[PDB]
Design an enzyme around this catalytic site. Structure first.
Site, PDB file in Angstrom:
ATOM      1  N   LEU E  38       0.913  -1.159  -0.100  1.00  0.00           N
ATOM      2  CA  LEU E  38      -0.018  -0.025   0.035  1.00  0.00           C
ATOM      3  C   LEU E  38       0.767   1.386   0.031  1.00  0.00           C
ATOM      4  CD1 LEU E  38      -2.384  -1.204   2.750  1.00  0.00           C
ATOM      5  CD2 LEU E  38      -2.967  -1.301   0.447  1.00  0.00           C
ATOM      6  N   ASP E  39       0.353   2.157  -0.238  1.00  0.00           N
ATOM      7  CA  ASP E  39       0.908   3.851  -0.357  1.00  0.00           C
ATOM      8  C   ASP E  39       0.482   4.544   0.999  1.00  0.00           C
ATOM      9  OD1 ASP E  39      -1.366   5.210  -0.631  1.00  0.00           O
ATOM     10  OD2 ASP E  39      -0.842   5.253  -3.113  1.00  0.00           O
ATOM     11  N   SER E  40       1.118   5.625   1.225  1.00  0.00           N
ATOM     12  CA  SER E  40       0.666   6.363   2.355  1.00  0.00           C
ATOM     13  C   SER E  40      -0.721   6.935   2.160  1.00  0.00           C
ATOM     14  CB  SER E  40       1.786   7.555   2.450  1.00  0.00           C
ATOM     15  OG  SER E  40       1.834   8.346   1.561  1.00  0.00           O
ATOM     16  N   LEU E  41      -1.366   7.241   0.983  1.00  0.00           N
ATOM     17  CA  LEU E  41      -2.532   7.718   0.611  1.00  0.00           C
ATOM     18  C   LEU E  41      -3.406   6.521   1.350  1.00  0.00           C
ATOM     19  CD1 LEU E  41      -2.292   9.036  -2.937  1.00  0.00           C
ATOM     20  CD2 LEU E  41      -3.002  10.461  -1.042  1.00  0.00           C
ATOM     21  N   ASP E  42      -3.177   5.190   1.064  1.00  0.00           N
ATOM     22  CA  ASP E  42      -3.770   4.267   1.570  1.00  0.00           C
ATOM     23  C   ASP E  42      -3.692   4.112   2.938  1.00  0.00           C
ATOM     24  OD1 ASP E  42      -4.528   3.219  -1.286  1.00  0.00           O
ATOM     25  OD2 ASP E  42      -2.604   2.291  -1.445  1.00  0.00           O
TER      26      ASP E  42
END
Ligand code: 3PE
Ligand code: 3PE
Ligand code: LMT
Ligand code: LMT
Ligand code: LMT
Ligand code: LMT
Ligand code: MYR
Lengths: 171, 61, 155, 61, 84, 108, 79, 459, 67, 103, 121
Positions: E38-42
């Site tokens: 996942l990414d930091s937006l996620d």
């Protein structure tokens, strides 16, 4: 103090919460939340950091224009309807020291266990103060971070008021 | 007259009694709210009597 | 507390500014006294005119109800800026626009009420008629004097 | 704000020289305004102190 | 009345209804970045669902540090005074 | 439409043009501010956590504040003087002439 | 202790979250949180009354009781 | 008055001849017995005052002030004995002696027939009061507080002496009963303007009049608890009592001479009430509160109406108990945290639940909740000044709002909110302190049942 | 307690709460219908409102113009 | 942006202490150690006696023998008299009204 | 409504002034005009303690209703016929005030016409 990455992520969360205040209905919010995410994903890989700062500044100008004037606030968050509601019931633990002996006699088990914690506190304090002296540079702390305990039987320095703080629902 | 004026004052005196009992004369902390609620319910009944006399003949004093 | 730790006179030289900044636990770059008048601020720092409501509610303040840390210099008007009193937080609507819209709304209503008084609503009927000379005696008129008769007729 | 608006209506009734009508609205208003608050309190209690209507819904049944 | 197991059950339950996470790879120790991709937006959206699941706000400074389900369980347990 | 700050409504930090241009000098100043805060925090905490301490932790910042604070003068008196004097001269003139109603006035 | 219902039953199909997911697909996007919302459109929450239906709660028996009452009052009045 | 003078004097040998550990018990017990007998002064008649002798008399004005004086001595003893516990025995006995000597001068001051006798006693109260502040205050600037208090008084009191001696030469007597019958009107002239000012300025400083008030907050911040109690409750009322008496011989010149003082009072009460909203020292806030309340008394006395004099009498008694109670409440916090800063110790209702109730009651009387005698006195003055000029209702009403605001602000700031984390020495309220608070408020509230005994001669 | 909480599901109801609610909803509608049947003029009008134009000049006492 | 290994270890150590502290706030079985329809009507019957009957006795006695014995303490609005009434004190009969025009 | 549009947005000279009515002699156009007859006497309205504003030309129907209401207690649903008689008399009373307004309006129009006849002559 905040990184660029932190500012973008704070804005995304703040923007999503206000969007939910507008949409209200879950199906409507889901639809527009995904559109909002796609606006952030568009410029996710912008490597020109002057351009990236322009994107964020305009984004925050856009947010200020489009924010909800009465956004939803969680009841116990700052500004919510239950914020600090239970502070009047929080009583610091030193108050038990002043209890009359007849009051303490009503809870013999509780007060014997309290004495063990007070003994744990007294015997730990010097090592805590020493650990902080050894680990603090000459100028003094440059940040507020506190260390863990490093040996066995040591307690993390300055633990008493964290560990023994009032319960969130104390009564 | 005498029933009308006595009962209209009883309505007021009855409401103050739970406040006076806070001076610990005959105080049951276990269910003070039930005690206060009961007095309100009894005061309502006692006040319906002078109201009924007023509706009947328009008695006022 | 010693005298050297207490507020002093307005700082004159740059070496007094550095001492004053240190006394108040400030960077000398940030330290700035109130303008030298007879007002009586001495060297007490002039800090930003912001409410305590504007401080981060999540930070672990030593005084959470006031959002102050032990040892930090207190605004001269702290007692005005506590959370129960004057708030300076940003508003979703500009201050000047709010004043126009509120003043415009009140002024428009006051004007319309004036119009409503000058052109009142009423129904197409004549005066209500009362017997016995418009109830002369009932309204408290003098029994000994004789009122000028009021006579009502059938229509 | 419903109470403030209802109070304004009562003030209007005083302004048209209808004091007894204004008084009747005090009495009638008392019943259903106190009921509405008690119903809102029922909802708020069942939703763990939530008071924003944007987080209610689907409570009819 | 919340329990340590009760909190953990609901934290994973929410994550198992998130299409970007495969429920077979998910454990309490799965790092949202290193293990799940996942990414930091996620991550911000995961924290927001947790706030919605338990009905209280996690301030941004704390939320950015919660990178696996166990750290969320610990954080919720600590603020709710759950010791069992 | 840009934000116009007022005395009673500050500029939001997300709209402040100096929040996005942070140089080495600005970062250095912030670190110096954090260092001052941390040093005071430690000094406070070593007393606040001291199990043997009973009392008040005297705060020199609080003392300096109360000391500093404990350290339009005829105009309203003249204004109010003329308001009341003018009113009472008018009132006295009418009573002497009988043109003021005091029919039931026997409390004063 | 408290038993949670199986998470796999929460499907968006047959709910307005499916309509949302179709309108996003037209744009090339997808809603990844759809099933977290699905319980709100299912079970005992699937069908709720309209505003008119809410106002008419109790009308059927209030009308039936009323018809009996005017019928009774019309009969007695005829006597 | 010898039945009160002599037993008060005998309190001195009682204190000095007591066993070392009985000085507070004996002085307190016997001063309470004197206070009980003071109720025999209530034998007041509708027409004539109670005229004992050639030296002393008691009317409905002096009687309530006498009872308040003798009630306050045991309360001051109770309030003082804790912070004097470490004092050596001789200096404790000397402290109690000053309080007794203050009572002696006060009861003689309130009952003297002749105005020079009133003057000497009125001046004599300065000595023990000054000694109590400068010797037994805690802080360095108690020395300055003494000089300000001493020289503000003498700056006004010396012209008063000259006027009093001048009046006796012209009239032949200063016996107050004689003045009632031989009083002559004061005609317009510059000589009479200065006679008026000399007859009044000394009492204005005591009240204190707005603009001559800065000695008062200075004095309170430095005084020990007993000093504040007697100062707030009785010593201010010496000026109020003096004005109520000497205005007899100042008509009709008071008609126009009162204006500048009424303006100072009417505006000053708003200024001092507002100042209370920003005070950071609790004792200084209560001191400014007194200035605002006493401004009403000055207006009442100057407009000279039967309603205003009754309100002035009730306000003087009501303020005395209320303000004394507030200093006692403020002092109870101080004896724990050793600071007068109002913002230092917050949320004390969580820690001291019953003392919070006393704070609540003291605040409610301070803002004049009906039907406390605090409101009765204020209402009567407001009634009478409206007739004097209808516009005064605007300043009176605004002052009521501000008084409620600062009274409750005091209560919210110290008792509500969160408690200060590091203050961990807030021990439970002692029986002595609870008794002290209740010995103020209970008689104050009981006076609601029979207000007539505090409404004064015009009743 | 006697009602146990549920997760992501419609809550457990008692039979008393459902019946009592239906009774009082039906009471409200019966009362409205009963009152309207007997007092519809309270909503519609108690008396006829005349049309002043239909009044004749004779009954209002308006003399003929050429007079 | 996660925790650092020292932040995790301090939080873990504090967590263990906090849970032990919270566990110790549970009372023991013996705590607190304390020092040594007929029921409906009777409870309601005693309440009516003490809070209604006794107060009304006192009030009635007070109104009857102390308040009403002084002038103008309880003043009534006099009863309305309609055409056709009979006065109890005197036996007077109030004449009817004039006959109405039909309506 | 409508009558207000004619006055404020039309010719107010031919519209009644509600605060000055009537402005024509009561007998102008009415040969032999009867007086309104009052049934209840002043003493009867005084003894019944009627509110002054109720002491009008319908007061006898009110006095009958109030007596019924007292006599029927506790039956608070009786006296319904007596109440309607009072309400009906008030209705007719209101219609009489409407006629006075309509008479006034038409007499002001007749006067206006009689002024163009002279302005032509
Ligand atoms: C006539 C005489 C007038 C006398 C006025 C006295 C002025 C006193 C002003 C307060 C003084 C400071 C005391 C502390 C009060 C305070 O500062 O609290 C601020 C408080 C904020 O409340 P809130 O908006 O709900 O926000 C809270 C969440 N942060 O908000 C408050 O509680 C204070 C708000 C009241 C401000 C005064 C406004 C009064 C209305 C005046 C306009 C109306 C005109 C008069 C009425 C017309 C009648 C037709
Ligand atoms: C120095 C200032 C003195 C003011 C002048 C007073 C004076 O000397 O007046 C003379 C007059 C006596 O004259 P006599 O012959 O007896 O009677 C006929 C009146 N021309 O005297 C009188 O008639 C009245 C004398 C009254 C005594 C005045 C006392 C001093 C007045 C100045 C102080 C007043 C202001 C107080 C300020 C206090 C400051 C805190
Ligand atoms: C049944 C309801 C009866 C009451 C209805 C009351 C409505 C009356 C509204 C009057 C108030 C209108 O107030 C008026 O609004 C416009 C639009 O912002 C303002 O206009 C100003 O602000 C806008 C927006 O920033 C810009 O165009 C520009 O700055 C300027 O024109 C005026 O400065 C203001 O005077
Ligand atoms: C001839 C003309 C002069 C007339 C004088 C008349 C009085 C004469 C008194 C003589 C007796 C004095 O008494 C002597 O002083 C004091 C009080 O009395 C006593 O000692 C005192 O110590 C302390 C006070 O400090 C107290 O406990 C208590 O007051 C008393 O015990 C001595 O133990 C006693 O020896
Ligand atoms: C806070 C302090 C407040 C101070 C308030 C000051 C009030 C000032 C009052 C001014 C009036 C003084 O008193 C005034 O004195 C003069 C004395 O010459 C008197 O007048 C007398 O002298 C003048 C000479 O100029 C003659 O014209 C006059 O015939 C004679 O009677 C006035 O009859 C009197 O009115
Ligand atoms: C003065 C007299 C005033 C009038 C009195 C009239 C009597 C009122 C009788 C009410 C009793 C009705 O009883 C209630 O009816 C409804 C009918 O939908 C039932 O409801 C039923 O249908 C609804 C769906 O529409 C669901 O709740 C469910 O399918 C089922 O329970 C309730 O389960 C039952 O408890
Ligand atoms: C006819 O009987 C008139 C009844 C009143 C109808 C309401 C009309 C409201 C119009 C707004 C008025 C604007 C201010 C003069």
């Amino acid at each position: 103090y905040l990184t660029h990455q932190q500012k973008v992520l704070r804005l995304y969360k703040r923007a999503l919460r206000h969007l939910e205040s507008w949409c209200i209905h879950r199906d409507k919010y889901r639809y527009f939340a995904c559109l909002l995410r796609a606006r952030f994903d568009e410029h996710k890989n912008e490597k020109d950091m002057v351009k990236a700062t322009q994107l964020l500044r305009e984004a925050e100008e856009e947010f200020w224009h489009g924010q909800h004037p009465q956004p939803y606030i969680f009841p116990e968050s700052p500004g919510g309807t239950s914020y600090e509601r239970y502070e009047c019931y929080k009583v610091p633990e030193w108050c038990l020291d002043d209890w009359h002996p007849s009051e303490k006699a009503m809870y013999p088990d509780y007060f014997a266990k309290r004495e063990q914690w007070k003994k744990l506190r007294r015997e730990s304090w010097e090592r805590e103060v020493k650990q902080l002296q050894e680990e603090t540079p000459v100028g003094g702390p440059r940040t507020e971070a506190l260390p863990p305990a490093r040996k066995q039987g040591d307690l993390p320095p300055l633990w008493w008021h964290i560990v023994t703080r009032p319960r969130e629902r104390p009564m | 007259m005498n029933m009308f004026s006595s009962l209209s004052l009883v309505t007021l005196l009855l409401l103050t009694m739970p406040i006076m009992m806070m001076s610990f004369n005959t105080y049951k902390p276990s269910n003070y709210p039930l005690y206060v609620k009961t007095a309100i319910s009894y005061a309502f009944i006692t006040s319906m009597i002078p109201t009924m006399m007023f509706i009947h003949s328009g008695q006022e004093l | 507390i010693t005298k050297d730790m207490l507020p002093g006179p307005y700082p004159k030289t740059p070496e007094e500014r550095a001492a004053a900044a240190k006394k108040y636990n400030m960077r000398v770059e940030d330290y700035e006294p109130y303008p030298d008048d007879g007002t009586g601020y001495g060297d007490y720092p002039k800090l930003p005119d912001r409410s305590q409501q504007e401080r981060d509610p999540w930070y672990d303040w030593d005084h959470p109800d006031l959002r102050l840390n032990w040892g930090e210099p207190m605004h001269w008007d702290l007692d005005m800026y506590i959370r129960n009193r004057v708030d300076t937080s940003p508003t979703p609507v500009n201050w000047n626009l709010m004043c126009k819209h509120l003043f415009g709304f009140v002024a428009f209503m006051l004007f319309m009420f004036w119009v409503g008084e000058t052109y009142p609503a009423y129904q197409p009927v004549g005066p209500k008629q009362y017997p016995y000379n418009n109830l002369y005696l009932e309204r408290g008129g003098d029994p000994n004097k004789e009122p000028e008769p009021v006579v009502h007729y059938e229509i | 704000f419903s109470t403030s608006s209802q109070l304004g209506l009562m003030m209007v009734t005083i302004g048209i020289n209808q004091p007894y009508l204004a008084f009747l609205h005090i009495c009638t208003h008392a019943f259903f305004k106190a009921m509405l608050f008690m119903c809102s309190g029922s909802i708020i209690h069942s939703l763990n102190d939530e008071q924003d209507i944007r987080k209610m819904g689907g409570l009819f049944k | 009345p919340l329990t340590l197991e009760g909190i953990k059950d609901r934290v994973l339950y929410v994550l198992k209804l998130y299409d970007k996470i495969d429920p077979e790879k998910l454990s309490v120790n799965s790092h949202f970045m290193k293990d799940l991709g996942l990414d930091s937006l996620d991550q911000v959206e995961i924290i927001m669902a947790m706030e919605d699941e338990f009905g209280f706000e996690i301030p941004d400074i704390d939320a950015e540090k919660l990178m696996c389900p166990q750290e969320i369980v610990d954080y919720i347990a600590d603020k709710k005074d759950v010791y069992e | 439409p840009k934000y116009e700050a007022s005395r009673l409504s500050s500029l939001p930090t997300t709209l402040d043009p100096a929040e996005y241009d942070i140089s080495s000098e600005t970062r250095k100043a912030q670190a110096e501010r954090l260092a001052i805060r941390s040093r005071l925090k430690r000094e406070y905490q070593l007393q606040y956590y001291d199990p043997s301490r009973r009392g008040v932790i005297e705060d020199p910042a609080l003392v300096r504040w109360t000391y500093a604070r404990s350290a339009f003068g005829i105009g309203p008196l003249v204004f109010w003087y003329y308001v009341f004097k003018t009113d009472r001269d008018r009132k006295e003139k009418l009573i002497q002439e009988g043109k003021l109603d005091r029919t039931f006035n026997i409390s004063y | 202790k408290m038993e949670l219902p199986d998470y796999k039953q929460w499907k968006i199909e047959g709910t307005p979250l499916e309509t949302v997911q179709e309108k996003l697909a037209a744009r090339g996007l997808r809603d990844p949180w759809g099933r977290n919302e699905a319980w709100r459109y299912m079970g005992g929450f699937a069908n709720n009354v309209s505003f008119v239906g809410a106002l008419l709660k109790g009308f059927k028996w209030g009308f039936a009781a009323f018809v009996v009452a005017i019928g009774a009052e019309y009969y007695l009045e005829s006597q | 008055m010898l039945k009160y003078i002599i037993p008060t004097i005998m309190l001195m040998p009682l204190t000095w001849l007591s066993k070392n550990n009985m000085i507070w018990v004996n002085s307190t017990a016997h001063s309470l017995l004197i206070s009980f007998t003071s109720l025999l002064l209530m034998n007041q008649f509708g027409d004539n005052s109670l005229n004992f002798s050639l030296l002393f008399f008691s009317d409905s004005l002096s009687t309530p002030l006498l009872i308040l004086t003798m009630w306050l001595l045991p309360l001051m003893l109770m309030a003082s004995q804790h912070h004097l516990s470490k004092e050596n025995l001789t200096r404790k006995k000397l402290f109690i002696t000053m309080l007794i000597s203050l009572q002696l001068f006060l009861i003689m001051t309130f009952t003297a027939m002749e105005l020079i006798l009133f003057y000497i006693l009125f001046e004599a109260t300065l000595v023990p009061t000054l000694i109590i502040i400068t010797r037994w205050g805690n802080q360095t600037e108690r020395l300055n507080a003494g000089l300000y208090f001493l020289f503000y008084t003498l700056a006004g009191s010396l012209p008063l002496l000259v006027a009093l001696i001048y009046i006796q030469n012209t009239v032949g007597s200063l016996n107050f009963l004689m003045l009632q019958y031989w009083v002559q009107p004061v005609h317009n002239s510059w000589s009479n303007v200065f006679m008026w000012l000399a007859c009044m300025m000394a009492f204005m400083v005591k009240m204190p009049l707005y603009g001559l008030h800065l000695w008062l907050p200075k004095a309170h911040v430095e005084a020990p608890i007993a000093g504040s109690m007697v100062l707030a409750a009785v010593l201010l009322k010496l000026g109020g009592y003096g004005m109520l008496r000497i205005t007899l011989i100042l008509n009709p010149m008071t008609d126009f001479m009162a204006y500048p003082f009424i303006m100072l009072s009417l505006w000053g009460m708003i200024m001092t009430s507002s100042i209370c909203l920003r005070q950071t020292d609790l004792k200084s806030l209560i001191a400014y509160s007194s200035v605002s309340h006493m401004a009403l008394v000055i207006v009442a006395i100057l407009i000279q109406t039967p309603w205003s004099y009754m309100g002035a009498t009730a306000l003087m008694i009501a303020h005395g108990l209320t303000s004394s109670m507030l200093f006692c409440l403020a002092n109870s916090n101080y004896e724990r945290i050793h600071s007068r800063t109002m913002i230092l110790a917050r949320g004390l209702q969580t820690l001291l639940p019953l003392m919070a109730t006393w704070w609540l009651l003291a605040s409610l009387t301070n803002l004049a909740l009906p039907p406390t005698i605090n409101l009765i006195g204020e209402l009567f003055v407001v009634m009478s000044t409206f007739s004097w000029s209808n516009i005064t209702i605007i300043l009176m009403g605004v002052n009521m709002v501000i008084t409620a605001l600062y009274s409750l602000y005091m209560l919210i700031m110290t008792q509500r909110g969160k408690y200060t984390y590091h203050i961990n020495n807030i021990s439970p309220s002692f029986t002595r302190e609870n008794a002290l608070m209740s010995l103020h408020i209970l008689p104050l509230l009981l006076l609601t049942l029979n207000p007539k005994i505090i409404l004064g001669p015009l009743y | 307690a006697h009602i146990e909480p549920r997760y992501r599901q419609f809550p457990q109801l008692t039979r008393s709460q459902v019946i009592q609610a239906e009774f009082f909803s039906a009471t409200m509608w019966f009362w409205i219908l009963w009152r309207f049947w007997h007092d519809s003029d309270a909503v519609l009008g108690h008396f006829p409102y005349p049309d002043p134009s239909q009044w004749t000049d004779e009954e209002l006492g308006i003399p003929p113009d050429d007079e | 942006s996660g925790y650092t290994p020292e932040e995790k270890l301090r939080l873990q150590q504090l967590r263990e202490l906090r849970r032990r502290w919270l566990k110790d706030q549970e009372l023991s079985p013996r705590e607190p150690v304390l020092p040594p329809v007929i029921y409906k009507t009777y409870r309601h019957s005693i309440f009516a006696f003490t809070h209604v009957l006794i107060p009304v006795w006192i009030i009635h006695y007070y109104l009857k023998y102390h308040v009403t014995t002084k002038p103008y303490t309880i003043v009534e609005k006099k009863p309305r008299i309609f055409p056709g009434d009979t006065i109890l004190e005197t036996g007077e009969v109030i004449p009817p009204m004039k006959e109405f025009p039909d309506q | 409504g409508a009558h207000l549009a004619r006055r404020y947005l039309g010719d107010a000279s031919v519209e009644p002034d509600p605060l000055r009515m009537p402005t024509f002699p009561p007998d102008y156009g009415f040969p032999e005009r009867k007086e309104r007859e009052m049934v209840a006497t002043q003493q009867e309205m005084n003894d019944a303690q009627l509110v002054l504003q109720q002491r009008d030309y319908c007061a006898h129907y009110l006095i009958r209703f109030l007596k019924c209401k007292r006599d029927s207690f506790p039956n608070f649903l009786a006296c319904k016929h007596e109440r309607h008689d009072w309400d009906y008399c008030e209705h007719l009373d209101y219609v009489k005030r409407m006629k006075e307004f309509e008479r006034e309006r038409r007499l002001l129009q007749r006067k206006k016409r009689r002024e163009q006849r002279e302005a032509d002559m």
